Amino acid sequence: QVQLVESGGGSVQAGGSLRLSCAASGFNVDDYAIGWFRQEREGVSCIGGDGTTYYENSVKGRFTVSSDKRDNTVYLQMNNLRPEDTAIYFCAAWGRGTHVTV
Amino acid sequence: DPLVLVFVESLYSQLGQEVVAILESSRFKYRTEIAPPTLTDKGRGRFALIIYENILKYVNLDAWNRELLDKYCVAYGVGIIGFFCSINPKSPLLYVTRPSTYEPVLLHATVVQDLGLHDGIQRVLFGNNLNFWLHKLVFVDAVAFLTGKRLSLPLDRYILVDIDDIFVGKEGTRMKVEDVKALFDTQNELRAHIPNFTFNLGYSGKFFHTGTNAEDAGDDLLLSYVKEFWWFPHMWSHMQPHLFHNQSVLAEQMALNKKFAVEHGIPTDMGYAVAPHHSGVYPVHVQLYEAWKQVWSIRVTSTEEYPHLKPARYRRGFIHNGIMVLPRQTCGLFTHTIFYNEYPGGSSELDKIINGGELFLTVLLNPISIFMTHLSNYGNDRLGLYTFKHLVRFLHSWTNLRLQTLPPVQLAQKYFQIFSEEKDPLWQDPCEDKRHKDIWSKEKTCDRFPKLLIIGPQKTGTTALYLFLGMHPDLSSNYPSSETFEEIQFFNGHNYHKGIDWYMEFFPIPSNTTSDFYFEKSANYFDSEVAPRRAAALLPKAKVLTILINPADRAYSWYQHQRAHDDPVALKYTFHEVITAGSDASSKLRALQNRCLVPGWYATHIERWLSAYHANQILVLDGKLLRTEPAKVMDMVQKFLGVTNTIDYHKTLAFDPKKGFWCCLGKSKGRKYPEMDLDSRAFLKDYYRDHNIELSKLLYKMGQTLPTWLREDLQNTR
Ligand SMILES: Nc1ncnc2c1ncn2[C@@H]1O[C@H](COP(=O)(O)O)[C@@H](OP(=O)(O)O)[C@H]1O
Ligand SMILES: [Ca+2]
């Protein structure tokens, strides 16, 4: 069974940081794309199985997506948070979704 | 003529098979020949493109033939292709390919192009073999510019992305919410590249609610998503149509899918359909085609097994029962593909099809494309989304072809306006291919095919040899027709467009009858061009039999044959002006001359019926031997046939004085008539001279029985 559980939320409303953790239960996180989607749904990041990294232009100097094979969890080390970033962030191979307030 | 002359090393060469495979898939007219012929026939354009599989055959050929082809290439302007990375944009053959003393093409380059200064002719030399997709991509343009746009492919590509087996998964192998939404978004985002590009879906309604709660939620989302999507008919329970030998059960299956179609707002105005594993389509089942037009009005369909499954570059299309059948080429996506790693062949096997496999061959050598994929490649891992997206990205990244995914009706119409000779079908034997035997219904038998062929011509003794071979205990005849009677008129006329089962109706069942040997006397097969190729395609082991008499006597016999058949052209016009008629004549007199003097040229018709069969299968017989002592001629036809129990025909047959032949036989084969005119005989001997000396060296060339009439009329000339 493929399941994707995400967590992490809230920030300094003038600008702060977060590390959203998307845990891949039941399958391997290094075999799938695990691209992050913010609400329609917009794919601001992606983290490939060899570790390649793609961003949109709004997030390109700010966000840092990452992966860890050991806890089988893809992390989104966010930085310098604009007020436009507030959304439901979906890690999709979809997941339940978690809310950021900034 | 745009006949492509190919110099292959052997018939089993791999590069030669690839070159001729590209040639028949793009319908380039070819003729196979081993590399060492007649370069021009009576000072005309026999060839227009000269393809060499080996460059050493073009360089190290005979000096007389080399200077002769140089004279032919300078005087007529033909193309020379010789087989031993981006594309150059400043090239005159960039009508298909799109860039992502001699001039380069694939920039030196593996595919070069010379303007012509040393030999004064345009030529293209392939440094690499035919394995990479780019080589084939520029090979089409090389063939087109080396022939002066006479062997081309149109710019308007017509791609039909078809998706079979919708709602066929049992549990866990279906679609969900995210993949369905990504499928609709994939159709709309890629609609800017290609006008009205969609994903034609093959729905099944029995396996619709067998999935889980997550699988059912994604399938119910497609019902309100039917506004901008194309869907094609399939059947309810997803079973092959050869098991359904009745119209009721198969029509009820598609009627249940029609209920499924009108129930969920699915459009039925498309006219396309697919059966699972392509059952009952080749061999043509009347039940499947009639059920298609009866309950769904399907006029466009597809097939993956014409004239055999292996390979796919030999795939054709045909128009049967008003249904324009097209060739179907899968992209490797079958129903056993669940995940990315559950694909048959690994993850690199699907990428092989994307980066230059069957996908690119189907959209490049054929202007019309049909593809095969199912719901299981769109669910758990989205195989077809990535595959078709990268495919269509490859098409706009490598082709100038203005491609539009339009409805299948005009897509099939364009397939038949481009391919004019592919309008007619070409039937084969279903028992030679075990896959075709499994695809065809098991209700019918397998040995209803005859083993002897009587090509004719008429008025030479074919009815006598037909009726005298029916009294043999190990030889059996066919059922007589209503209009043609002993003739079946299948291979030479329009009866060939009726199906393989149409020909089996005339022959008896091998289980009910004790004798399995069959034959038919269709004597109008001699004066035909399409008949030997069709006869060799359906029956490659059926031996032929032809009888020849004097062409003056046969022409006068045809003249009085038309006189007994109430033809007014033979009744009014005298035979002497028919043999001397020219261009300034009536249409009826020209038609009578075309049916009276044309089929007396036995050399051209034996050349037609000889190029499609083995020389041992042919047996030419003299007619005067059948008139004087036919029993010895029946002894040679028994040794030619190889029967089990040979009977004595000297005891059974006897001389008949009122018939004039040894026999019993009809009045139409023993008509009494007076002789000709001396001037008519002189002009008939001078008219049939070249045909008689050509027939003399032609019959002596085959090493068979030399005729007595040929020896009698040959001594007057030589
Ligand atoms: N043994 C034979 N029995 C009957 N006809 C024969 C024969 N050998 C040759 N023939 C010729 O076969 C012709 C008829 O051939 P077919 O069966 O194709 O109609 C006849 O032409 P004619 O009867 O006009 O003189 C006859 O000359
Ligand atoms: Ca199927």
Author numbering:
A (entry chain D): 1 to 39, 44 to 97, 117 to 125
B (entry chain A): 82 to 117, 123 to 170, 198 to 213, 234 to 240, 263 to 818, 828 to 882
Q: What did the study's authors say about this model?
A:
Bifunctional N-deacetylase-N-sulfotransferase (NDST) enzymes are the first to act on nascent heparosan after its polymerization, converting GlcNAc sugars to GlcNS, via deacetylated glucosamine (GlcN) intermediates. NDST1 is a Golgi lumen resident type-II transmembrane protein, which contains a single pass N-terminal helix that anchors the catalytic luminal portions of the enzyme to the Golgi membrane. We have carried out a detailed structural and functional characterization of NDST1, the dominant human NDST isoform, revealing a 3-domain architecture consisting of a non-catalytic NTD, in addition to catalytic deacetylase and sulfotransferase domains. A distinctive feature of the NDST1 protein architecture is the opposing orientation of its catalytic deacetylase and sulfotransferase domains, which effectively precludes a simple substrate transfer mechanism for bifunctionality.
Unexpectedly, we also observed an approximately 2-fold enhancement of NDST1 activity upon nAb13 binding, indicative of allosteric modulation that enhances catalytic turnover. The NDST1-nAb13 volume was reconstructed following the same local refinement strategy as NDST1-nAb7, owing to a similar hinging movement. Consistent with its weaker binding, density for the nAb13 portion of the reconstructed map appeared disordered, and could only be modeled by rigid-body fitting of an all Cα nAb chain, derived from the nAb7 structure. nAb13 binds toward the side of the deacetylase domain, in a region that does not obstruct the substrate cleft. The rigid-body fitted nAb13 chain was found to lie within 6 Å of NDST1 residues K331, E333, K336 and R537, indicating these amino acids may be involved in binding. As with nAb7, the nAb13 complex displayed a more closed NDST1 conformation, as well as improved ordering of the D319–V332, C486–G512 and T528–L538 loops. No overlap was observed between the nAb7 and nAb13 binding sites, suggesting their inability to mutually bind NDST1 arises from allosteric effects. We hypothesized that enhancement of NDST1 activity by nAb13 may be caused by ordering of the D319–V332, C486–G512 and T528–L538 loops, which together form one face of the deacetylase cleft, and likely contact HS during catalytic processing. Accordingly, Michaelis-Menten kinetics for NDST1-nAb13 with respect to K5 showed ~86% increased kcat compared to NDST1 alone (0.26 min−1 vs 0.14 min−1), indicating improved turnover efficiency. As with full length NDST1, nanomolar K5 affinities were measured for both NDST1-nAb7 and NDST1-nAb13, thereby ruling out the NDST1 deacetylase cleft as a site of initial substrate binding.
